[PDB]
Amino acid sequence: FDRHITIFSPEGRLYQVEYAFKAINQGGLTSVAVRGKDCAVIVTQKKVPDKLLDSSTVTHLFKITENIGCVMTGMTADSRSQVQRARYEAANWKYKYGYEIPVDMLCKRIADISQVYTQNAEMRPLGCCMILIGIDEEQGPQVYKCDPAGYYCGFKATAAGVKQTESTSFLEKKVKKKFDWTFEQTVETAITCLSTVLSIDFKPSEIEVGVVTVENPKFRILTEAEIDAHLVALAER
Amino acid sequence: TTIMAVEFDGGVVVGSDSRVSAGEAVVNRVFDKLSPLHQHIYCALSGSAADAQAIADMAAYQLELHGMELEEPPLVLAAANVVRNITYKYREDLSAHLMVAGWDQREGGQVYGTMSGMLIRQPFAIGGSGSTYIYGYVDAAYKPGMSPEECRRFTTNAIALAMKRDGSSGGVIYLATITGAGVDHRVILGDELPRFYDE
Amino acid sequence: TGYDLSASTFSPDGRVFQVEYAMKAVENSSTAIGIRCKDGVVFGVEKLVLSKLYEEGSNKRLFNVDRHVGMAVAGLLADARSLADIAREEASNFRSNFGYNIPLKHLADRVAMYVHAYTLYSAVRPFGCSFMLGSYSVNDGAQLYMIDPSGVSYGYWGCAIGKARQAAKTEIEKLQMKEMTCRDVVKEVAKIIYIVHDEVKDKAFELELSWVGEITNGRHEIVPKDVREEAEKYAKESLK
Amino acid sequence: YDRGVNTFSPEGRLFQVEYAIEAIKLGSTAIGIQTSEGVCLAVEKRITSPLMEPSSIEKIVEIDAHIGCAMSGLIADAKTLIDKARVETQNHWFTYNETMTVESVTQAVSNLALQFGEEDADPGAMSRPFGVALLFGGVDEKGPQLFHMDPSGTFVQCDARAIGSASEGAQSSLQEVYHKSMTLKEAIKSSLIILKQVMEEKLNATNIELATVQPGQNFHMFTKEELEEVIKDI
Amino acid sequence: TQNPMVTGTSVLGLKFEGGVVIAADMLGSYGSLARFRNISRIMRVNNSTMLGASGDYADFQYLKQVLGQMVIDEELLGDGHSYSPKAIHSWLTRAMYSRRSKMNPLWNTMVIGGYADGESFLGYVDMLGVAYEAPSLATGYGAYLAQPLLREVLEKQPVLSQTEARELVERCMRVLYYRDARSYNRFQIATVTEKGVEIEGPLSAETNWDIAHMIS
Amino acid sequence: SFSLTTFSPSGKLVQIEYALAAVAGGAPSVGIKAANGVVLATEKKQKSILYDERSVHKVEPITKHIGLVYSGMGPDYRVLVHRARKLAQQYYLVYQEPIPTAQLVQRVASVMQEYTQSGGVRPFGVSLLICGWNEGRPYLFQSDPSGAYFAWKATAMGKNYVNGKTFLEKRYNEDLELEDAIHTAILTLKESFEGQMTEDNIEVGICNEAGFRRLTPTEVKDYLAAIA
Amino acid sequence: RFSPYAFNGGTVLAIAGEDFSIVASDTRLSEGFSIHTRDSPKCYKLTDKTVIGCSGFHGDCLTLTKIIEARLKMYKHSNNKAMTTGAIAAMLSTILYSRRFFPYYVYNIIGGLDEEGKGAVYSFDPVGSYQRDSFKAGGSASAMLQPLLDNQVGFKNMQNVEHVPLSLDRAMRLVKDVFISAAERDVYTGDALKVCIVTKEGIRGETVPLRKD
Amino acid sequence: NQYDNDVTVWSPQGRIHQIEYAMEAVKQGSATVGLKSKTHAVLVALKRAQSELAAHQKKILHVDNHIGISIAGLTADARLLCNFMRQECLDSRFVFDRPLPVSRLVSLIGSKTQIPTQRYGRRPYGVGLLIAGYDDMGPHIFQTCPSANYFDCRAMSIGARSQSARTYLERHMSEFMECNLNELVKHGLRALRETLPAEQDLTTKNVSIGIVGKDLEFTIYDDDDVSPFLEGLEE
Amino acid sequence: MSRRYDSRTTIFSPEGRLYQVEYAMEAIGHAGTCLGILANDGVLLAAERRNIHKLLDEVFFSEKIYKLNEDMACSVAGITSDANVLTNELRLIAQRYLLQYQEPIPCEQLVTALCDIKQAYTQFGGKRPFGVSLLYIGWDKHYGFQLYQSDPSGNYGGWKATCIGNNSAAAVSMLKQDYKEGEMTLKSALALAIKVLNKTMDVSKLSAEKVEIATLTRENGKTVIRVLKQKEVEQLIKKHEEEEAK
Known about the structure:
This is part of a larger assembly, with nine protein chains of nine kinds. Chain C is an alpha+beta fold. Chain C has one domain. Chain C is built from six helices and ten strands; from the N terminus they run αββββααββββααββα. Chain C is globular and about 55 Å long. Chain I is of the alpha+beta class. Classes of the chains: A alpha+beta, B alpha+beta, C alpha+beta, D alpha+beta, E alpha+beta, F alpha+beta, G alpha+beta, H alpha+beta, I alpha+beta. At the F-I interface, helix 3 and helix 4 of F face helix 1 and helix 2 of I. Chain C: It is found in: Cytoplasm; Nucleus. Chain C: One of its GO terms (biological process) is proteasome-mediated ubiquitin-dependent protein catabolic process.
C-alpha cells in the first residue's frame, strides 16, 4: 500500500512524496532566480498558447507581499492554491508578530504545511514548489526555495522545472569563477541560462521578469519596454 | 479626542490631535491616532482607545488580504464596510467609533463615517468627544471649491477650535493630505496653532 | 492498477486521473460560447430540446450569479446548480462584507479555490462542470473568465465550452471582436450556434442569449424574444 | 466485503435489504386474519425440548388496548421495535389524546426501517437492516384492521397475511379459507387448520398461542383454559 | 438590545386609488442632536412595492443588506416571480420576531406599501411583532398626529386620487414638522403606481407662522 | 481513523520496521560522552556551491544545557523540533527549571509511540540522538522511531553505523578529556565519511558546564589540522 | 430595556349549543391608548367544525396560529382526516408547554362540534391547562361576559323556572347584546362584531354593528 | 469493475455507476402519468397491491392545497423525502404565509439530492417524483431524478412501459391545452392504459387520480367519484 | 476511509479466537525471562537482561522492573514501546485511586482496571492491541503479600509463583517441584529463584550485570522495596556457585 497512501516503503522512503516531485515537471515550464549583491531577480517563461488567451490574466510571477516576490513551478491548480494560503500565512505573521514576515520564516511555515500533508494520509501533498525572494534588513537579499517535501535551504541561485541540472550547471560557471553580481549582470546570467538550454533567445513578450533591489524594496515586474532595454543591451555585450 | 476630514478636488485632508487621556489624566500627550490601513487608506481612531487599536489591526488584516488578491489599492468604500461590519456585529463588546477616509482611482478622495455602526458619505466629517462643539464653524465657514491651501487652514482652524473647548483634546495637530501623487504628513507645533479670540 | 481510484492518490506519471475524468464528462455537455468587446460581453448557449412535452423556458441554461455577473455552465447540471448557489453565496457574503459588487477576477478566484478544495480530499469528489463568468463595469470594463473542473481561471477575449469548443474558438479568431458592438456580436454568436449544430445526433434546440454592457446599462440581462428573433434573421441571411 | 451497506446492485437494489427479507424464512410462523368481527392472531411456541418454559415465549405482543401485534424473523431486532412502537403509540395519546390508527402505527415504525447507514449519522444509528417481519392487527374507528410490514418498511392493508418460514404455503392457503363474511370464530377454526398443516409438530392446546381483538372487547390472549376449548372444536 | 444610537423619525403612508404614497424625513438623529441631514429613508423593492422604516437606522441598513440581497437574489433567479407586498410584510414579521427569542431584538418600525394587480397594499410591522393592514398608517407620533387626519378623509372619501393624496401628505408633512421636535424640514415623497415606484427628490413645505403675530 | 500499524503474523510491527530501516540509511552521525563534556559531530553535505551553509543547520539546541542531532528524514525532524522545544517550554511553564535529559527524552519518545497507534498517520522517520547537561553529569541518549530510548557512552548513527560503533568499541575507552573526545569523534567520523573533509562538510557541537554550544567554522578548521 | 410583551386588549366568547357552537370576537386592535385599526379579525377557522379564538399579545397570536395551522397539515396528511375539536385542544396544551420556561402570552379559546354533534368549548391559559365547559370567555372583558352567561345560558341562581335547552335564535341575540353592553364599558371592545356559528350543515358568518367609541 | 463501489470514484469515462443504479431504481416502480392544461392539472396514479388479499398501496401524497405529487421508486426513500418536501412547504406557510412556488420546491428537492452525491458514504435518494401544482402562472408539471436533475414539463409518464403513453402524450399534446376538467380525466385515464398490460386494464379499485385547478384546490379521488370518470371512456 | 485498508481486527476466527490478540502473546513469547515468587516474609521478583554490550550505560535502575506505587511494583515482558504507556497508565490509575479513596490501592483493583482498558481496545476503536504482559507484586491491608500475572487479552489471575517470557514453561515446571507452599520464606525463596534462573538460562557465565533482582517486604509497618546492588548480587553468585558444583 506504500504507493497509494503515504506510508513507509520497504526501504523507508515515501513514493507519494516522490510522485509530488514528478508532478513538478508536468507543468512544462522552467524558472530561474539569482540572488545578487543589492538585488534579487526572478526570470520565468510566459506561455500564451492561444491567441484569444488574455496575456494580462496569465502571470507566473506572484506577489506575497511588498518586499517578497514569488514564482511557482509545478501543477497550476496546486500552485495558485498554495499562494493564496501563503498570503493567508504571511498576513497571519503581521497580525501576530507585528512586522513583515522574512523570507526564511515564510518558507518555514509553508514547508510546515507540506509536512502535515506528508505525515497524514487524509490529505494529499501539493505538486508545486515555491521559489521566494526578498531582502532582509540584516543579512541582505534572501532567496529561498521550498519543495513539496518540505525541504528549504538558502540558495545563491535557484532552478526549477524541466531544466534543473543543466540550469544549475550554468550557474556553477558564475559562482565558481566568482563573478561580480549586480542588477544588470544577474539579468545577464538569468536570460543566458534559460536561452542556451532551450535554444530559443526569448523575446521580451515571451517572458516576465520580477525584480527587487535595495533602493527599490517593493517587488515589481519589468515592463516589455524595459525588458527589451535589458535584452538588446544584454545582446550588445 | 477630535478627528476631522474634509474632501476637496484633488483629495482629502484628515486631521487629528495627539492627546490621549484615560480618565482625567493624560496617558500620552503625543500620539498618532491615524493608523494606515493602506498606502492612501487611513483610519482616524476615536472612542475607546483600546477597542479602536484592536479594530485597526483587524481591519488592516482584512484589507491587506483584499488588496493583495486584487493587486490594486482597494476602494475607500471597501475599507469603510470592513470597519462597519466589525463595528455593527461586535458593537456588544466594542464601543469604539472610527472614521474611514482615503483616496482611490475611481471617485478620488472620500470620507466615510463608520461611527455607531452605520455608513454614509459626506464632504466633511468630524468625530470624537470634541467634534460636538465645532459644528458651528464647520457648517458656516464651509465653502464649495476650496483650494488645497484653504482646506488645510479650514481643517486646522476647526481642530484648533476643538482643542480649546474640548478638555480631552490637545497636543499637536496632525495633518495628512491624501492625493493621487502620494500622502503628505505634517505636524503643527503648539506655537503654530491658529490664534482665535482670547477673551 | 488502483492509482486512479481516489483523487488523493497520484498516478505513476504524477497526475490525478479523477480530475481528468471529470473533464471528460464536460465534453458531453451542450455547447455554450461567449465573446467580450468594448461595448460589453455577449452570451449564448445551445439549449437542446429533449422532448416537446417540456414547457417553454424550461431547463434555463443562462445562470445569473450576481447583478453585474452572468454565468453559463456546461457539464453536470447537478453540480451546476450546486456551485450556482455557492457562487451566489460568495457574492452575497462579499457584499455583506465589503458592501459592493465583487470584481470578476476576485470572484473567479474564490470560486475556483472552492473547486480545487474537493480535488484534494478522497472523501469527496471534484466538480464535473465547467463554466464561464462574464462581467462589465465602468472602471474595469468587459471581462470574460472561464473556470475548468480543476479550478483554474483564464482570461479570455472569447471562450467555448461543451462538446464543440476548439472549432468555435478558431472561428472567433478569424475576425476582430474588440471593436465590435454587442449588437453586431450577437449576430456572430447566433451565426456560430447554427454552424456548431447540424442534424446528425441531436434533433432540435433553442437559442438562449444574454447581454451585459452599455445596452443593458452594465447589468446582467437576458435578450428579449423580439431582438432574439431579429438577431436570428441576421444569421438567417447567410447560414452559408 | 469490498462494498458498503449502501452499495447498490447492478439491478439497483440494496444487498443488505435483499438479504434481510431472505432471513425471515428462518423465523417463526404467525398467521393473522382480518374479519368483520375482529382480527385473529395465531403463532406456534416452537418448543424443541421439555426443559423450556412456554411462559417465557411471547410471539404476540400488545401495542395498545385495541391494537395487537405479531412477531417473526430475528428476535433481537424485534424487541427494539416493539418498545419503540409502544412509546410512539403513547406519544400519540400524550399529544392528541386519542388512540393511534393502526395505519399510523405502521407509519411511525416504517420510518426507522431504512434509516440505516454509516457516514453522516449519529451514535444512535443502526448498522444492519431489520431481520424482523411484523403484523399489526387491531380495531379502530374504521373497524378491525390487519397490516403487515417487511424489512424495506412497506406497509400494506391486508385481509389476511402470514409470516415466518411457512408463510410461503400459508399465504396461499389463506386465500382458500377466506370467503366474504366469515366470522372470527370461523376464522379461528380455519387458522388452526392451516397452522396445523404447516407445522412439523402436533397441534396442542399449550403448543400455540391464540389472541383476538373485537370491536366490543379489548385485545385478549386466550389462557390455557380457553385454548383447550378452542382446539376441541377441530 | 444594549445601546443602538442612530435614531430615526416618523414615517407616513396612505392608500389612494391605484397607488400608495409613503413619505418620511431625511434626518438622522443621535440623542438630541440632528447630525445627518441627508439620508434616504425610503427603499425600493422590485417595481411594485416599496419600504420605509424608523427607529435605529443602523439596524435599517442591516435590513437593507439582508432584505436587499434576498430581493436581488430573486431578480437573479429570473423565475418570473416577484415578492408580493404581503410577502415582504410577512417576512419582516417573522424576521423581527426571531430576534426576540434570542434576546437580541433590533430597534426599528417598518412600513410596507405596494400596488400590484390593482390591489393596493399598505401594511405595518414592529419590533414587538405587531402586524396588521390598514388603509392609512404612520409611525412614532404620526400615529398620534397624521393618523386621525387620514382617518377623517377615508371615512368621508374612501376613494382618493393621486393628486388629492399628495396634497394630503404635504398637509400631513406640514403638521408633523410643527408638533414633532425630532422631525425635519427636508422630506421625500415617494409614490408607487402602475408605472412602478417613483421617488421624488428633497422637498419642503410652506409654513404658516402667523401664530407668532396672533399670540403677541 | 483506523490504525495503519498492525501486528504481523510473527508479532512484529510492520510499519515501525521500515522506520528503523529508514534511519539506518540516513546521514552519518556520531557522538561521544567523555569526561565533563559530550561531542556531537554530524554530516552536512551540500550538492552544490549555491547552497548557503548558514541558512540550514543540522545540529540544533533544545535549550541552553541540552542539544540534539539526527539521522533520518528532514521534514519529520522539524516536527520533532517544534514539539520537543514546546515540550521544554511547557516544562519550564510548570516546573520553572531547566529540564532533565531523562524526562525530556521520555515524553518526546512517547510522541513517537502515539503514531504507532492512532490511525491515519505514519510513524516518525527520524532517530533522535539527545545530548544534555544536568547536575554536573553529562548525558548521551539515543532514541529511535520505535519510542524506546537508551543510554550510551559513545555510539554511531546513519549510513555505516555498525562500523562507527565497532571503531569506538576498540579505540574509545574511559579517561578521555573533552579535547580527546573531539579528536576521537573526528577519527570515527573520518571512517564513515568519504572524500575531502572541510569545516562546512562537518557540523560539530559540544555541551559542557557552560551549556550546549555549536562550534564555529573557524575553530573547526583548527581541529581539521589533526591537532586535538 | 426590552419589554417582550404588551397587552393588546380584545374579547373572545364561545358558547356550546345543543346542535351548534357559536364563537364571536371583536375587530378592534389597539395597543396602549392608541388604535392600530378598527378591523382586525381575531377569529380564525381551522377546520369546518372548529374555530379558534385568540386574545392576548398580538405577536404571539399570529405566530401561534401559524404553528397550529402547520400541525393541522401534519395530522391530516398523516391520518387522512381532519382533527376533532377535542384533538386540537389537547394538542395546543403540549404546544404551550414546550415554551414552559418562556411561555407564549395569549389566551386561547377553541370551540366547535364534536363527533356527536354537540358543542365543545375549550378555554386555555398561557401555561396550557385546559377544560371542557358549556360556555367560556376571554380577553379584557372576560370578567364582564361570564356573569351574564351564567344567569341567561346557565339558568343559575333561579328558583322555580322552566329550563329550556339553548336555542340558536336566543344564542345569537345573547351574544350580540353582551357585546353591545361590553362595547359600552370596555375600551378594548367595539367598532364591529363578527359572529361565526358552527352548525351541522356548516359555518355561517355574521357582522353586527357596534359603537365607534 | 472496481469503479461501481461508491459514488465519489469516477469511471475512466467520467461517469458514476451508483447514480446510474439509482436512476434505474425509479424505473422499477409503478407507472404513473400526469398532464396539465392552460387551466387545470391532473395526476393519474396507478396503484398496485402486494397480493390479491392486500389492499392497493397509495401512490398519491398530498403536499399543499394547490400542490400534489406521485411517487415512483423506493417507498421509504419517498417517505423521508416527503417529510422533507412537506416540511419545506410548511416552512413556506410558516414564514412567507403563502403557497410555496412549485418551481422553488423542486429546486429544494434537487439540493437535497445533491448533498449525498458529492460525499462518500451517503447514498443518493433512489426515488423519482412526478409533482404538479397551480400558481399565479398556471399549473405546472415537474419531474425529478435521483441524479438531482429536474425539468419543467407539459405532461410526462414515468415508470415501466411509459413510452406508449408518452407517444400518446405527443399526439394529443395540442388538445391538452384547450380541454376542460372532464376531458383531462378522459385523456389522463386513456394515457394510463398504454402503460398497463393487455389483461388487467382499468378498475376503480387500483386506479386513483387527483386534480388541481384555477379556483379548485388539489383534491384526491379514489372510487366513488372515479367510477363516473371511467364511464364513457372506450378502450 | 477506504475499506480496502481496514483489516477489521474485530473479526472472530472460525474457532472463536482473535488474531491480533494471539499474535500479541507470540511477541511476548520472545521477550526475556521474567519471574516472581510469593513468599511468607516478602515477595521476590527477578529477571534477566537480554541486552548486553560493553558500551551500554544503564546508570539508572532496573530494566524490565518498574515501581507502580509505594506499596506495589511490577515487571515487564513485551514491546518496550507499549510498556511505557502501560507503566504510565498503571501509575495514572493507581494515582486516580488515591484521589477518591485516598488509600493505597489493593493489588486486585489495579489489575482489573488496566485489563478493562485492554479489552476496550480489542472491542472497538480500530487500534491495535497491546503487546506487553505484566507481573505485579506488592502488599495490601486485606490479602497481604500478592503476586499477579496479566495477559494482553485482558485476562489475569493470582499466582503463588510464575514466569513470563523466554523459558517460561521450563521455570513453571521447576516451580511445580521445588516450591513449598506455606513453608519457604523470602530468604529461602531467594536462593530458589537464583537456582531456577541459572538452570533455565542456557547462556553461561551469569554475572551481576546480566541479571537483576528486586525485593519488596513490609518491615515495622512500612513497605520496603529495594534492588540488590551488583556487589550484593555477586555475593549471591558466590553463594549459588558453591551450592551448584560443591
